[PDB]
Amino acid sequence: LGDVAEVRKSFNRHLHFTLVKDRNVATPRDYFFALAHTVRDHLVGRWIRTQQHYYERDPKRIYYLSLEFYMGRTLQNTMVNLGLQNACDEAIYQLGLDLEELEEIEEDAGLGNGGLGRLAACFLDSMATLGLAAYGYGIRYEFGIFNQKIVNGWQVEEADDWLRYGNPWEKARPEYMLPVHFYGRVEHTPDGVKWLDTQVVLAMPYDTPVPGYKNNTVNTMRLWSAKAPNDDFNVGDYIEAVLDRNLAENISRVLYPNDFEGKELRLKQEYFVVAATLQDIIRRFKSSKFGTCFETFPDKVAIQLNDTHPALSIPELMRILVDVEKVDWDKAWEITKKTCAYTNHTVLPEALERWPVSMFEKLLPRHLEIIYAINQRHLDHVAALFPGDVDRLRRMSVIEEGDCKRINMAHLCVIGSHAVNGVARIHSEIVKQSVFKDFYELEPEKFQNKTNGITPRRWLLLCNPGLADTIVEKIGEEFLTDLSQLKKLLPLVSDEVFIRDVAKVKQENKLKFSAFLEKEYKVKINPSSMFDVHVKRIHEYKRQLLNCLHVVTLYNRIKRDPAKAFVPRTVMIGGKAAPGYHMAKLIIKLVTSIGDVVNHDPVVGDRLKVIFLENYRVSLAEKVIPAADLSQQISTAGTEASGTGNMKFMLNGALTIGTMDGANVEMAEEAGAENLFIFGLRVEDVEALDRKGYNAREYYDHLPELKQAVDQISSGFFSPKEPDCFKDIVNMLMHHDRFKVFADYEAYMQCQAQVDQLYRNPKEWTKKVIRNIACSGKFSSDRTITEYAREIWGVEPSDLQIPPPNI
Amino acid sequence: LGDVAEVRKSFNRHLHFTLVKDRNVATPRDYFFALAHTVRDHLVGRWIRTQQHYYERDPKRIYYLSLEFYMGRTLQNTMVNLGLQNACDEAIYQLGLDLEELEEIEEDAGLGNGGLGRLAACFLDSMATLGLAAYGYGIRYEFGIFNQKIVNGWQVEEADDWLRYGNPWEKARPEYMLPVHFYGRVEHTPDGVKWLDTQVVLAMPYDTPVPGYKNNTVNTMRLWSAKAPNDDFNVGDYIEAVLDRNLAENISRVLYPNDFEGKELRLKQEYFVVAATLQDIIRRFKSSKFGTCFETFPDKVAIQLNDTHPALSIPELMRILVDVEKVDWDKAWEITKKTCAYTNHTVLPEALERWPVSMFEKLLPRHLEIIYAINQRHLDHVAALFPGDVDRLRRMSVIEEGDCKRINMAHLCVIGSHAVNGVARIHSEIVKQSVFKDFYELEPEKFQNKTNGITPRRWLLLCNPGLADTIVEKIGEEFLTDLSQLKKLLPLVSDEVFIRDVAKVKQENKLKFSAFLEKEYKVKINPSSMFDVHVKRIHEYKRQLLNCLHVVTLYNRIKRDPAKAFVPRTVMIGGKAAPGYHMAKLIIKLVTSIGDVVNHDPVVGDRLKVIFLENYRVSLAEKVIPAADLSQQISTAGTEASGTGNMKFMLNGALTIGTMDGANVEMAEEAGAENLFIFGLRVEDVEALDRKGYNAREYYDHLPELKQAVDQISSGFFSPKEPDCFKDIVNMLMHHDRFKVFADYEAYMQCQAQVDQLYRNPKEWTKKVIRNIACSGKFSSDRTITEYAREIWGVEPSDLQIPPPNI
Numbered sequence A, B: 001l002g003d004v005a006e007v008r009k010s011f012n013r014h015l016h017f018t019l020v021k022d023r024n025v026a027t028p029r030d031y032f033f034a035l036a037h038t039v040r041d042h043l044v045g046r047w048i049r050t051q052q053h054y055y056e057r058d059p060k061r062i063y064y065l066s067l068e069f070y071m072g073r074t075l076q077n078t079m080v081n082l083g084l085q086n087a088c089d090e091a092i093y094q095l096g097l098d099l100e101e102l103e104e105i106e107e108d109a110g111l112g113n114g115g116l117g118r119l120a121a122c123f124l125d126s127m128a129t130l131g132l133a134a135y136g137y138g139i140r141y142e143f144g145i146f147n148q149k150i151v152n153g154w155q156v157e158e159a160d161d162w163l164r165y166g167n168p169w170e171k172a173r174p175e176y177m178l179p180v181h182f183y184g185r186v187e188h189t190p191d192g193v194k195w196l197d198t199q200v201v202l203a204m205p206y207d208t209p210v211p212g213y214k215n216n217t218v219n220t221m222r223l224w225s226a227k228a229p230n231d232d233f234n235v236g237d238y239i240e241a242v243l244d245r246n247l248a249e250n251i252s253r254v255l256y257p258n259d260f261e262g263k264e265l266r267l268k269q270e271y272f273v274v275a276a277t278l279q280d281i282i283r284r285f286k287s288s289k290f291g292t293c294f295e296t297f298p299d300k301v302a303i304q305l306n307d308t309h310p311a312l313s314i315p316e317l318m319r320i321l322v323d324v325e326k327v328d329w330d331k332a333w334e335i336t337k338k339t340c341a342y343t344n345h346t347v348l349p350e351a352l353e354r355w356p357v358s359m360f361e362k363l364l365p366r367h368l369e370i371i372y373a374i375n376q377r378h379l380d381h382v383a384a385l386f387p388g389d390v391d392r393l394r395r396m397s398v399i400e401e402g403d404c405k406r407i408n409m410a411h412l413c414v415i416g417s418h419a420v421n422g423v424a425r426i427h428s429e430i431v432k433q434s435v436f437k438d439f440y441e442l443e444p445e446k447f448q449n450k451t452n453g454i455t456p457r458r459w460l461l462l463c464n465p466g467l468a469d470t471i472v473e474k475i476g477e478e479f480l481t482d483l484s485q486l487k488k489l490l491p492l493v494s495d496e497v498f499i500r501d502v503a504k505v506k507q508e509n510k511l512k513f514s515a516f517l518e519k520e521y522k523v524k525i526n527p528s529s530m531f532d533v534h535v536k537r538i539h540e541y542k543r544q545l546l547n548c549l550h551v552v553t554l555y556n557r558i559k560r561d562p563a564k565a566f567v568p569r570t571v572m573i574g575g576k577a578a579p580g581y582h583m584a585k586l587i588i589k590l591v592t593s594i595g596d597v598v599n600h601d602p603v604v605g606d607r608l609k610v611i612f613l614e615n616y617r618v619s620l621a622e623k624v625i626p627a628a629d630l631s632q633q634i635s636t637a638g639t640e641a642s643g644t645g646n647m648k649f650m651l652n653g654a655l656t657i658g659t660m661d662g663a664n665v666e667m668a669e670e671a672g673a674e675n676l677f678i679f680g681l682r683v684e685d686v687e688a689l690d691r692k693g694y695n696a697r698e699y700y701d702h703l704p705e706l707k708q709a710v711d712q713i714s715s716g717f718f719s720p721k722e723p724d725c726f727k728d729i730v731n732m733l734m735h736h737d738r739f740k741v742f743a744d745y746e747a748y749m750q751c752q753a754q755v756d757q758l759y760r761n762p763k764e765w766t767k768k769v770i771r772n773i774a775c776s777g778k779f780s781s782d783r784t785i786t787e788y789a790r791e792i793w794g795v796e797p798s799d800l801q802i803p804p805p806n807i
């Protein structure tokens, strides 16, 4: 190949001219950078051409606004979307280096946190693959959230210094910087409303390429860094300036800060992305090749609000249009509603974001005025349609009364958007009928569903090339951009060759992940054991404790009859606890405490191993998901909207043990519920238990295997040196357990036995797996994005065709 | 040429892949950057090879430590030292751009201030041209000193945001960062002295290439940026951290800060460069290919102290050697004295740098201990050689008594260095016999002279290619690296062709600078008028006022007899005033006030124009010096050590009006005093006037042209709206004038008449010019550096021969 020679020549060129190093002084990190630059150069040609193409053809632009972008690592994705993986592997080998070693030096982008952020990243990959003129907008968080470390079995938060050595992917655009205004006061003058005496924070843009899979599109993620404007002063004025500089820069410091007016910092962050972004969208709109003029704005601009975090987009668009662009209020409002769309990710109305009005009086006095005007006009309309309905007016109002007046940002999003969607079929029904019941009665057509999805490139082609090839051999390459083509795998459940091939891939993946496990955690991993994986946020509603009780029950069962034939398990539990969440940190400690007992018991041996997977991130998900046999998706029914981890396990050859909630429902409906290990209380059963009243004591008293497990946890069997360590866990499970852990224990145990009986038969296990994989095509973010594009954005995929670039 | 095609291809490549731009979105600044990168790539090959060569051949390394590096602009110097000027000019033309326009977009590096900084930059260029293994070490000042603006005839200081858009020349080395310690306390333990509880500031290195002229050497300038280490805290601890972060970062904010414990900030800056640098020098020494071991240190390392600013090098080298490297005190001291050398730039002992010991007690307690030990051992030696001489001990001590104990940093430099030099022959005699009289008596051999110099590349080949070619045609190219070869021009004073050629070059230069003048200042410049140039620091001792009085006298002379034939003059006065220097700001105002009257008087017309050259910098020196007919070097005799501006005018075809002091003396001695316009009080005459007592009133009273000029200044003729504006100027000239402005007025007037009579005869003017240029070869920094290398560093130039690189 001439390709292998080009990468080799480009790597050395970057090493000498970009890094200003030679092979004697270079570190592995320098080698990662040299390669990352080599690979980025292949994107640049397409990136320039793509932006030249959108300027020429002026397509409708999609703006995806999120406070989270859980991007992971970029080197591998970039290499695969450009087809250069094989050429780089060989070039790096010939250079005396190891591609996978270099891949491990890259930092996980500290730009996301959980589901909401990964959803944004999958979306961006799909929008680029579908040829949409899409731009991701967010904050360039300098220190991510935090890297989880486990010290003495407890979680410790370490700072995520991911930009320490620089990010090779991003380009700084200091020339496209915009001012963000805070505080000040508002004056009504004859020339229009003026927002005066404001503090100014500068928004500095950094652009990152978002490549399309096997097309020529390379889109942009534009992330803003907070910087103070520089400069008279007395001693006090000098200290005021240094502090304002620091408070400016900590807007883009960490995701979801705590600090207790660190809530004011969250509001500042929200406005900082909104104002930065909207000024950029408008500037792009009026700077079009060949440009009263704002009437075409809803035809050239869609703004998607990923949760209520970017909710200020509504009154800020109203502000720029009316106070700067001199557009008439009514016209600006009809423009606002048509440009904005809102996606909700939560169930029950109390999770929805609220801000005190007093906080708005101080930080954003002009936006408060606009919000008040939007609300009044909205309630006049409601009063016209439903005369004398006084309680309807209070329910539908964006401003709520209580111990202080508050602004319901969700209500503001509903009123200022043309479309409102939930993230799964039943969640979207709850969004309609319960969360925004009154809004649904007034405008049913506004409310929609956009079932979540995952990208088939990262969550298959990247993390599981072995499985990807085995599917490619049988049904060709077209499924990678049209994942519903995996249904052609259905007849292959009879094929003895395919079954032994899918099983071989899984075991290869299991062996590669065992090697990571033994090296890092120092536990002897059984290769023939079943990989039982539960990876998500440590939270009571997610019920890692339910999984803990199962593990203790199994430990006790091996101890009672050590001669008995037992299905071997490697139980992996991972996830980050919120720093101030006392119960979740107790739970992490329980898992490691259980593991200490289980993994060091000589009677137990190679039958049961328990590991807490430290620092669950995007990059680690890509190692563990392809190696999983069983996926635990065991949240209490009625708590989960969707879930995307569910989808990742289904595509990578794992069977699912779960409740009938969130994504599991649509996964059952796609593959048939018999191919999934559904158990426990149904949404309606949970409600019926609340009518009876949950008495967890009755369960503990009349379930012997559970009583033994809880007593061990309580008495200090898993914590000999500090026997009251889990007192608050036990106290919660018996008296305050809102998530009904005991109520689902029996059903969960019985269900795990059915899992054990199926794993005992390798062929029928893998047959059920093939049925899962073949019916997962629906859960492609391509499908989700095509849905958003046609039913919300009014754009057609592949209507823009970027041609091969010029160097 | 294949060269023109390569630059074109590299520019576009940098524009696309480095800048991530196309020609539609690119600004002229992007074009400057694209070109700057193209050109830097040619240095990199040599830069890598040079550092590979010094590692292989382990030569003795020269470390030039300065708090100032007045580098100017780099694009032109870089192009000429690589021979790519012509190829770039053509490539940029073919691209549709203008090289000189792009050259003007580059910022003057805000790394220097005056003479001391430019000396450092000329030295670095010479050391590279001579093939020395030389490293410049200093501070990367983020905001320079200040850009001078003239608003309403007064100086305003504007912030020098020179790094705003980035520096294309430098490479960040965050991996070679070193800690700097401050404060803390000191503990004597059995394992040696320990410096504990210190605050730590990080020194982040940035490397800049220093190319040799027509050789393959590219050396390094290593400049340190102050950064705080990142991270528990209460409300107060948080504010303490934010302030310490800011105080850390303002170490590398501005040159010579004011802030009144902004003196503590100067001390911090001094230590920050010393500690950063010495740790780097040692790390390089022990990391040599194949490395008790410190005995070879004085043979592999020379540290040159450019003034007392890096004086802490002595006790810090002692600290690292004894407390870290476990070297014996006596051995470490003999190593210290042999590695360090000190250059003094001042006359009279009261200008020498002192710090209160209390400030050292707090900021550097371990260095104070070391200084006290160095001093005691030094005074024991003095006590041995001169027993019972109690006053000799007090004079020779590094610690002085008074309103508080103080550390004389100059005494510390003398005691801890093997060599001590002045910067001109007579200044070096004063350094020996007066400033350090007692030290000279004890060790005469330590004391030396190293007459200053300027680089022939920047101060001839770059700023004056026209003159450079006219010399190249007659004596070939060898003078550019052996400037004493300009003596071959001496017989050409008879050559009628050469004389008219040198005059043609001057007039071309005058015309190009008139075009800059008319465009920027909006005054009609007479092309046949004499360019009278006085560019330096605005200070009473430099006597811009003496030049002001001459200009007023000439204005008055044209007004008395407007019909009379008068030699036309363009008088240019430039220079920056220290922000707190009331008299110097008054002086700038006087010049602009005079100009307002002179330049707008219709009786005067094209005979006399007065301009204040705004923001005298390196880049502006390169425009004005080649266009000058007359160089004013008029400081009071006995005040100037050397001067390098003097030298620049002499090389570029200007005649010198000056006093018999500093560089003027050696310039007279080189070209013969008859070829220079020497006037006024001699050093000995100044002393004799102090014996008589200077009564400036006697001069004002009995010199009518002066009385008229002073009365106009006093009465408000030059300031109609604020007639008492120059009251403090007049009050000073009559009662407190230490610089004897009136005493030299008559001699200066008479001398200017001789200048007027010579300019009246073009041929004899240019003959005298040729005599100046031909005898300027001595004032090459190559000569100075060869001198330092052989008489101080013990290195031979051209003993290291870097071979052509590999790409």
Ligand SMILES: *Cc1c(COP(=O)(O)O)cnc(C)c1O
Residues within 6 Å of the ligand: A113, A114, A115, A118, A535, A536, A537, A616, A617, A618, A619, A621, A642, A643, A644, A645, A646, A648
């Ligand atoms: C896909 C993914 C998630 C989402 O998991 P859910 O519990 O389904 O919300 C979270 N974190 C990471 C690292 C992921 O890759």
Ligand SMILES: *Cc1c(COP(=O)(O)O)cnc(C)c1O
Residues within 6 Å of the ligand: B113, B114, B115, B118, B535, B536, B537, B616, B617, B618, B619, B621, B642, B643, B644, B645, B646, B648
């Ligand atoms: C050469 C130079 C100097 C030194 O001038 P002196 O008065 O001779 O010390 C100062 N500033 C600039 C910009 C120079 O180029």
